[PDB]
């Protein structure tokens, strides 16, 4: 049995709290960065909430490795020690 599976279905609640994206907007290719025009000073805390929530770390280098629903579950997965 694996718990990570719950992450693939829980991600919706994550991305919804990360960039304040409504559940009716949560999409795999959610480009909130462009559509919502997520500024830099804003992404600082917005993206930070992903570290205090998941309890992991995500440097600028991997900032684009957990932005998408498929990348967040694909990265955080292998990242989860």
UniProtKB/Swiss-Prot annotation:
GO terms for molecular function: acyl binding; acyl carrier activity. InterPro entries: ACP, ACP-like_sf, PP-bd_ACP. It is found in: Cytoplasm. The modification O-(pantetheine 4'-phosphoryl)serine is found at residue 40. PROSITE patterns: CARRIER. Pathway: Lipid metabolism; fatty acid biosynthesis. 4'-phosphopantetheine is transferred from CoA to a specific serine of apo-ACP by AcpS. This modification is essential for activity because fatty acids are bound in thioester linkage to the sulfhydryl of the prosthetic group. GO terms for cellular component: cytosol; membrane. Keywords: Cytoplasm, Fatty acid biosynthesis, Fatty acid metabolism, Lipid biosynthesis, Lipid metabolism, Phosphopantetheine, Phosphoprotein. GO terms for biological process: lipid A biosynthetic process. Residues 5-80 form the Carrier domain. Carrier of the growing fatty acid chain in fatty acid biosynthesis. Belongs to the acyl carrier protein (ACP) family. This is Acyl carrier protein. It comes from Rickettsia prowazekii (strain Madrid E).
